Design a protein around this nucleic acid. Sequence first.
RNA 1: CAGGCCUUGACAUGCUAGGGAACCCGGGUGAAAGCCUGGGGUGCCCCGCGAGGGGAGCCCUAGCACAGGUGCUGCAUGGCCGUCGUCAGCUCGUGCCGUGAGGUGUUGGGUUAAGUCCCGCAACGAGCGCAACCCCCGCCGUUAGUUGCCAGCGGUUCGGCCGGGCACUCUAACGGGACUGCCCGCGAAAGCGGGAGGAAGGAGGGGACGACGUCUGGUCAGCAUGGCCCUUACGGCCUGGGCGACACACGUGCUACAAUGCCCACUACAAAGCGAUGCCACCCGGCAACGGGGAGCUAAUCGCAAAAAGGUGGGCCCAGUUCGGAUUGGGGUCUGCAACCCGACCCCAUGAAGCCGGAAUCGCUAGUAAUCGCGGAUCAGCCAUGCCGCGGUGAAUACG
Lengths: 97, 23, 83, 60, 206
Amino acid sequence: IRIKLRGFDHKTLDASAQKIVEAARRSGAQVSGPIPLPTRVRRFTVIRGPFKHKDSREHFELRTHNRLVDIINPNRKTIEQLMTLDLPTGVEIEIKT
Amino acid sequence: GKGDRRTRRGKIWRGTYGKYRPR
Amino acid sequence: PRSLKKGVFVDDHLLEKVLELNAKGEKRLIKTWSRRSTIVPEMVGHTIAVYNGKQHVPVYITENMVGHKLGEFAPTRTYRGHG
Amino acid sequence: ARKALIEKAKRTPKFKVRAYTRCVRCGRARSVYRFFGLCRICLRELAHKGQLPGVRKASW
Amino acid sequence: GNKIHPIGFRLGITRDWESRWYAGKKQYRHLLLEDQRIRGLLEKELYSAGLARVDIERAADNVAVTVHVAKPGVVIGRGGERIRVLREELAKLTGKNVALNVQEVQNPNLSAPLVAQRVAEQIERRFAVRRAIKQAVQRVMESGAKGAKVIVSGRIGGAEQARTEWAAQGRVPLHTLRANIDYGFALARTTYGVLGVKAYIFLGEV
RNA sequence: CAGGCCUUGACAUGCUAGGGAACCCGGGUGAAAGCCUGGGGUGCCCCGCGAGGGGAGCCCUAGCACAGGUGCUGCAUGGCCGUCGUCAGCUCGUGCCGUGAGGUGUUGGGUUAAGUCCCGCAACGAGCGCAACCCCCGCCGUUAGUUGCCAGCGGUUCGGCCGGGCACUCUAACGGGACUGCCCGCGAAAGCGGGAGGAAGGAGGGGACGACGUCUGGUCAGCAUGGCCCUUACGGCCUGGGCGACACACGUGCUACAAUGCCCACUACAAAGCGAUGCCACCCGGCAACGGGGAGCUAAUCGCAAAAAGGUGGGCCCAGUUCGGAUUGGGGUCUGCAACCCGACCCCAUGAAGCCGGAAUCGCUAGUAAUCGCGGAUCAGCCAUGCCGCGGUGAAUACG
Ligand SMILES: [Mg+2]
Ligand SMILES: [Mg+2]
Ligand SMILES: [Mg+2]
Ligand SMILES: [Mg+2]
Ligand SMILES: [Mg+2]
Ligand SMILES: [Mg+2]
Ligand SMILES: [Mg+2]
Ligand SMILES: [Mg+2]
Ligand SMILES: [Mg+2]
Ligand SMILES: [Mg+2]
Ligand SMILES: [Mg+2]
Ligand SMILES: [Mg+2]
Ligand SMILES: [Mg+2]
Ligand SMILES: [Mg+2]
Ligand SMILES: [Mg+2]
Ligand SMILES: [Mg+2]
Ligand SMILES: [Mg+2]
Ligand SMILES: [Mg+2]
Ligand SMILES: [Mg+2]
Ligand SMILES: [Mg+2]
Ligand SMILES: [Mg+2]
Ligand SMILES: [Mg+2]
Ligand SMILES: [Mg+2]
Ligand SMILES: [Mg+2]
Ligand SMILES: [Mg+2]
Ligand SMILES: [Mg+2]
Ligand SMILES: [Mg+2]
Ligand SMILES: [Mg+2]
Ligand SMILES: [Mg+2]
Ligand SMILES: [Mg+2]
Ligand SMILES: [Mg+2]
Ligand SMILES: [Zn+2]
């Protein structure tokens, strides 16, 4: 079972990944560590002024950080315990297999 | 040169394919 | 141009005019705005008043102007010259 | 011709090619970003106020 | 064009985002439009309550919304008679579940938006401008802040020629990233036009 | 802009009255908008098996308060921006000097990229600026090993494909490391010169960041806003045209004028990005643009994707040329309701000027210039040779 968690802010995402890794060992299933995936960076470049000043620009970027967690064994006791966790609202999760 | 559509270089410059720049 | 897998385009509001003429007294003076409509061989013999954006120019159709568009026979800019 | 243009753009046209994007904040028709739906001016204003999540000043 | 936005400069270093949620390419703009609608609606609702900060927080089809005001009772009311009402319309304005929270500001003198709003309100009352700026800066400095600055721009006192009047005390290191500087802005719509009010409050370095 | 049309209006609250609408498929005329149009249905609270009447989501007609204006004023303004100028400055409290404007501090000496620091001094201190705090690159360490990688081992249809491993590269979080820290010399000191070690040495390279103020600087057409002006029109809708004109003049670019080159075939080596009315593998048909089937991929998995300059081999042999690719004729593909005015691309034919450019003028000090290709935003399509980024190859010179 593979859990992929993404977020805009890396600190809360890392905290969620560490929480998942730590809690997954309550009923140990040979936990596979939280691995980081390549951050995806979207860039936007705007003219600074409202009118006619093309040579002045401002750069903005939006980054998506991605982490992956795997459990080798199912561990149903530890699986149903993962339903109600402490998930920061900025962290978006996805479970799959 | 790069302005000629009937060459590999010209098709590369225009970013297209054809008889002269096959894919 | 248009692809031959598609048919030659007529607005179907001017085509109805020439078609209805062809069996009901087939010669009159039609005013149209469909400059994008393609001339058809059936349209030969008609005088069509085509909008140039300001006025309707009368165009008398012949054989050697069948595949063109109506708008090519109503110039839209008046130039003359400089001076 | 500002309010009517905004509302007309918000309306469904007879042909699909007559639909164009406008800024959902000030109604601008030029330089409207698909990701946000906002024009560059409104995007800069909202980004400087911290109201665009994850959006930060870029420097590399 | 001279100065960068003090808050935007320090995002992710000292300041924190006002909206905190994650969305992909398909849902970002619709949630963003909803956030702007919510903030605009609440701005003209709790103006007399002293609305400083509005935070939007979304988990899954549910939005938190925490507001920070000078007088929580002005938002809640008698037994929540208004607190529920402002919530219900919000749901009817969002089509989701909302959890509107109210927070009190410990020091209204240390919140730059509130200082700027107060100065703008006084300017609208045809008060003297220079005295207002001096008094507001002195009030801020009286509450332990390490520095304060207030700037007003426009037709000060109805004059035909626009001017700028500013007052400052202490330290305002705008070039220091570790400095925790709160910025606030307000508009004054007087019979002769619009005046801009800016407030900088320095609260020490983290 | 021309013509055809609408009137409390395409958008917002409210007072009425007559209908009571609310929501949905058809008829004539018209280029369309529009105008005249033909068939059904409102919840909810009611007296209630009653004809029915009442308050209510909501709509239309006739009146109003009114909406609307990219109409004028950036010499009424907010906000934001450009500029002097990333220049090294601009000030303040108290004290002291001067009738006063004002001065001192902030001047002098040494030093620095720096009002940077040191010394001296009727000044003693402080603030905004400088620097630092933040990001990227360059060296190493810990946490981890999937979709990443494959040193050792065993298989193998010869692809990490598999088992297996996290050694290595890499990915992304946290740390260390560089601080004149050490030695010699110079000097009151700050500091300057030299050396060792170190991936990195004197601010390590590049970003983000723009003081008090100046310019009656720019923007009422991004938005907001004072005043003025219009109100069956300076408002609103549609069709068509124009913004693409063309005796000329200027700015910024692209492509060349060739052999350190051009053409053809084979063969290598990147980075950063984008992708669900999407990216499209592969196969088939057409010389081709492309079309028809049709996997995989909501994507470190699948695709765009071919990198090009390069390397190897051959052809051209100094010509307006196998240089150069403008202009025009013809045949087509695709997007779009629709490529005439006014799209892009493919194929055939045409093959212009141009032989290195007058007075003059511009950029650039190192992974820079030059040169080569690649991606992205906007976007149905594209007039992008633009803009913002990315990497490959890689100089010359600075005496002064
Ligand atoms: Mg008009
Ligand atoms: Mg479009
Ligand atoms: Mg648009
Ligand atoms: Mg001005
Ligand atoms: Mg201005
Ligand atoms: Mg100066
Ligand atoms: Mg003094
Ligand atoms: Mg005296
Ligand atoms: Mg000075
Ligand atoms: Mg002086
Ligand atoms: Mg400097
Ligand atoms: Mg200093
Ligand atoms: Mg600095
Ligand atoms: Mg390891
Ligand atoms: Mg002027
Ligand atoms: Mg002007
Ligand atoms: Mg305006
Ligand atoms: Mg105005
Ligand atoms: Mg133009
Ligand atoms: Mg033209
Ligand atoms: Mg120019
Ligand atoms: Mg030129
Ligand atoms: Mg060119
Ligand atoms: Mg030739
Ligand atoms: Mg040639
Ligand atoms: Mg066209
Ligand atoms: Mg010649
Ligand atoms: Mg020659
Ligand atoms: Mg010149
Ligand atoms: Mg230099
Ligand atoms: Mg060009
Ligand atoms: Zn906008």
